[PDB]
Structure formats: C-alpha cells, structure tokens
Design a protein around this nucleic acid. Sequence first.
DNA 1: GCCTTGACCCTCCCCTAAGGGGAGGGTTTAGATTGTGTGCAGTCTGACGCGGCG
Lengths: 50, 476, 50, 49, 100
Amino acid sequence: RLVIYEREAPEGTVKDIKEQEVYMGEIPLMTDNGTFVINGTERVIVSQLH
Amino acid sequence: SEIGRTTDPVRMYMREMGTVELLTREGEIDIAKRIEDGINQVQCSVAEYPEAITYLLEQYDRVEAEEARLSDLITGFVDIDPELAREKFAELRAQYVVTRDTIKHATAQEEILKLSEVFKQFRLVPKQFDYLVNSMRVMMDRVRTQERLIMKLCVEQCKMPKKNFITLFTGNETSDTWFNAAIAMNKPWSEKLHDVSEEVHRALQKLQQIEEETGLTIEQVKDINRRMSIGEAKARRAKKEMVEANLRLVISIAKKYTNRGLQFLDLIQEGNIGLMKAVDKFEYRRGYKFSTYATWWIRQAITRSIADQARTIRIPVHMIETINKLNRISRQMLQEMGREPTPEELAERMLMPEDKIRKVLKIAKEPISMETPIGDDEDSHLGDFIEDTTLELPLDSATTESLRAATHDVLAGLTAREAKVLRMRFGIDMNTDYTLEEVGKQFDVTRERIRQIEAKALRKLRHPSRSEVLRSFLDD
Amino acid sequence: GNRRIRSVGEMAENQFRVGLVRVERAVKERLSLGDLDTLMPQDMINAKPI
Amino acid sequence: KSDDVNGRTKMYKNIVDGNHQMEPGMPESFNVLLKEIRSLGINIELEDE
Amino acid sequence: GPEEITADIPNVGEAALSKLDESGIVYIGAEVTGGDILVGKVTPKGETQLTPEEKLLRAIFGEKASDVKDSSLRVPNGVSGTVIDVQVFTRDGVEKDKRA
DNA sequence: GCCTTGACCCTCCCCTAAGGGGAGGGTTTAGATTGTGTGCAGTCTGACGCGGCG
C-alpha cells in the first residue's frame, strides 16, 4: 500500500492510498520429505550449530 | 592530525576533499565572474596584436557570403541574431582601420587601448578564441626560442654571464649595436661568441621579417603575452576553486553507480572530469545554480565511463543501451506477469525482432574468473578444468610424420621430372605450392604440359602398386 | 546451552530479510523523487534482488 | 611426461619407433614462472654460458 | 553455424549407426557399450588448412574433405548399459525432429 | 611418347542505382540536489621490528 500524505497538516493525513499486489521473488518450496528441488536436483539445507 | 593513520585512498580523498567548503548562490556567481574576467583580460591583451583581429574579420567576411555562420564565430554580445553583429563588426572595423595608420610615439597608446576595450564586447565561441590565443602562443614561443637560441650559442662557446648581456639589447631591435658593446669589456668570454658574430645573424635577422610582420616591439609582444598569462592564470585559479568546491556533488552523484563494474574512486574521478567540463561550460548569466547544469555533465561522464570500462569484453554504447532497455522491459514484464518473460513476448513488448533479442541476451555476460573454486573448495579451480584445444595429438603428429615418409617413398618411385612437378605443384618439402605456369616457366615449358605431367603422375600413383601405403591414411 | 540450532526456515528468513533491505534502499530512494502521484507500488519494487 | 611440450611428442614418436630415449627440454611451467617473475619488476634470467 | 543432430555422420560406418533412428538418436532399449554413438551430432567447421602431403593424398584418391566434424554423444568407455529413456528438449523456433 | 595451341571453363572479386539498414562513434542535456557504507570474527604460534618508558 503506497500511502501518500499531503504536505502541511499537524496530522499528515492521507491524500490517497494505491494498494496492489507486487510480485517479489519465488520462494523454493520444501517437498513432503524435507528436500528442495533447486535447478532440478534435490538438495538438503543442513541445520547449523552456531 | 589524521596524517599517517589510514591506508584507504577513499578516506584520504574524502579527508582532503572536505577541507573546501560549499559555495552559496552568490559564491558561484562571483567565481564565475572571476573566470569571465580572467578570460576578458586574456582577450583585451590579445587585442594588442593586430593579425588576430584581421583573422577574425576574415572569418566575418566569410560569414557574409556564408562560407560559415556567425553562430560558430560569436555566441552573443554583452553591453544570436545576425543583424546586431553587423553593427558591432562595422564599428570594430572602423576602429581597426583608424588604428592601423596612427603610429606616432606616445599617440600610439590611445587607439590600441580603446580598440582593446571596444573589442572586449565580443564574447566569442571557445574555438575561435582558443585558436587566437594558441596562435599567439606559437608566435611568441618561436620568437622566444630564437631569443634563447641567441643565448644557446653563447653557452655553446664558453662561460655564460648574461646578468648584463641584457643592458642595451632592449630597444635597439634592428642591428648589432648591442652586440658590439660586449667585446668592449675584452674579458676572455667576450672573445668567444664574437667569432660566431656572423653565424648569429640569421637568428636576429629573422627578426628582420617578424618585426615587420607584427608591427610592435619585442617587449610589447612579450608583455601583452605575459598579461595574457596573468589573465589565464586568474581564470584558471578561479576554475580550480569552482571544481574544488563542488567535489561533494560528484560524490553525491557517483554513489548511485557504485556496483556497476567500476569502483567508487573510479566513478568519482570520471565524474570529476565531467565536473571540470561543466565548470568550463557553465553560464551564470542564465540565473540557474551550478548544480543544475553540472549534474548533467557529471552523470554523463560517469555513465559514459561505465559503458566504456566496466566490462572485460567492451560492449559499445548502443548495445549497452539496448541491454539496459531490455533489462527494464524484463523487469516490467516480470512484475506484471509474475514470471520471467520469454524472448518471443520480450520481443513483442519491445519493438525488436526475436532473433535480435536472442543475440542481445547472448551478448551481455561477464567472464568467469579461472580462479573460481569448483566444488566451492580451495584446491581445484575453474582454470584446472580448461584444456588447450590447439595442441596436436601425438598420434596426429606421428601420423603426419608417417605420411611424410610414405609420400617420400611413393615420390621416390616416380620419374625425377614427375616427382619434381608433383612436389612443386603441392608444397611438399617446399615452403609454397606453385601454379601450372610457375612450374612450367621454371622448366621453360607450357602450363598444359605441366598439367599433363602431373595428371599422368597422379594416375601412376592411383595404381594399387603405389597406393596401398597411402590408402591407409584415409578414413570412411 | 551456549550453542544453538539454526535451521532452513530461519536461514531462509535471514536471507529473505537481506533481500528485503536490498530492495528497501531502492524503494526509499525512489520515494524521494517527485514522480510520486502517478506510480503504483509495483513500479518501485524490483523482484530481482529479492 | 608432463610439461616438456616438444619433448613429449618426440617421446611418443620414439616409443612408436621402438627407441626408448628421451630428448628432454625445459618444462613449460618454468617458462611460465620466468614470465611471471618478469611481470613483476624483476629481471630473472638464465645465464646461458 | 548451428550444430545438427543427425544420423549422417562423417568417418563413421553403417555399423556404428545401427541403433540410431532416422533422427540420429539411439532407440530405447538398445544395449549399448563404450564408444557406441547415442546421439549423432555434427559441428560445422571450416578452413581445414590441408598439409601438402595430405593435400596430395586427397589429390590422388579424390576424396572430399568433410565440412562438418563428428561431435556425437558416445557411451563412456567401459560403460555398457541399456537405453531406458530419451528426452529431447527443443528451443522455441527450432523445428522438432521426428524423434521429438 | 614430349611439347605446343587454340579454345574453352572454373571460382572469386568487384561493379552496377538509389539509397536502406545498422554499427559504432561523437556531442549536449540550464528548477535543484554537494561526505561511501559494506562486512566479519570460535588460529595459534613463533618471530621480527618498533614506540615508549626507564
């Protein structure tokens, strides 16, 4: 939601809101067994002991 | 003091760059006024030499019949349409001609100065004014180089006093009247150069043309040129103060280009070159701020240097712009479709054919380092997997040697003439192969007889008696 | 008790937040420009860094 | 066996001719080394006396 | 020029193209061994720059030089298996062969 | 058989008229904008050269 406040008010109320759906990226989905298919091959994201 | 504390040249540059404070709207104006007064002083010092004004009026009468246009000769007037220039050129010609005849000597300093101040009115295009000042530099530097070849030979002879060799050399300008006074001391040094007293003539008698080609005295020319030097050092010191005050603007613009192939100081230096161009081109009489005009030149220089030197394999600016346009069209089509577009539809939103866009997509890729770790290891790199494909296989070399041996064998089993024309027709154990006419002329025989000989020798070699060794060197 | 497990759903979230700040700098840069009354939010969002 | 470029094809041809003799030259990586030390400001040189 | 998947390969007999279909790709179920051509492919080349000895060799026996070189996919040596699957991925604008 | 001879023949390169198409290069562009911006690191152990105190 791109919300536009006008210039001079003690409140800074809205002129308008332009609300819409943007596409930001694809998220690799995990399969039923805990793997990811990334560039065709199944991969495992190993947990980290830090 | 922070001197000696860091290694970063970015920090050193920012540190020495921040010691110059920003200018106000009024500071830019009087720095620009200092620049224009320096250039005006250079021009009013040029006006003392007449042939520059003669060349300029030559240019104007060339504009009269349109060998050129005065839009390329003058950018405007200060107290471009071609009617006011007629008035100013006429009043300047009426000044030059009324100065030409009045030569005396105190009266000669009224008309030259009023012509200087009335020639001040012309604010020329940079090309003509630069031509005039460089012409005067060439005149004065050839006059000056014979002036110091006069002393070059005097050092060629012996020990060189010239503390008082200058005493009456000033003003005579026609003859050796100053030269005779040197032997009048009769110290041994005053001997030497005097037996070169004849060889010196064509130097100071080449003055015989130039003092008749310039009209004014030697120090008059030298001192209007030193006034030109003072004016251009004033205009150059004022340009340096406008560049040094606006380097923060360059960093401000350059921080938006930081990861497109060039490093931050590379971008800053290219933008600094653009800023120096902007200082050269800025006009304060337009009422705009220096930032408004200078941003154009700074951005131009930075984007041009990114197109020039950001890539290993340089792409030209037209293809760089096609790649940039393709990239933002791909961004729009990826946002509006949630999916990376294919070259087919990427060629329908663009105006371009699909086979053009396919090669544009194949054209924009940066080389991989051969120190790239393969396996993300540190023991094997990409350069370890790349093969020399120009190497001949040792079985191919051994096949080549065996084939040389086999053709040597079969050519030994022919007549000496036929084997010679067959080793000459092809390049066998020669550095070049020959044509029928060359083989024939070397034999003093025709082309067609040599053709017959080599065709017959080939038919002989076609027989399986002579062919089974060579047929082994062929494949399916 | 001093060493902690960080798994795919947390490492992926950290990298997504990295991409989100990489797009946040460009969105803050675009909003500072005066093109502000005719643009939709999907014109200032770049899906490629994320 | 590895880097002598002219010597390894000669060795192949010598093996094929039944002559088990090598004519060894300079390894090519030593020439690469010499050219890389000279690409520093350093004059490294074989004293050919 | 473009490389071409084809069964028409230079310097390769009819015996080595026995288990390739008309598109130059091996049949499914073919028992292959090391060196067998799986997908026949030729790369266009040029400027062969014949040595004078092999130039005479081709002058005697009149055999033309190939404008293409055999760039085929072969079974790795020592590997002997059965072709159980063949997938052909063709670009848009390229015409699919009979096998695809 | 060796050697000419006149007639043919090949490819390859450049030319046609009136520009089309494109590549690759220059140039300016005037509201005003004036200091970057990232990390990352759980090595240890020698060993050398140096500011700084005594």
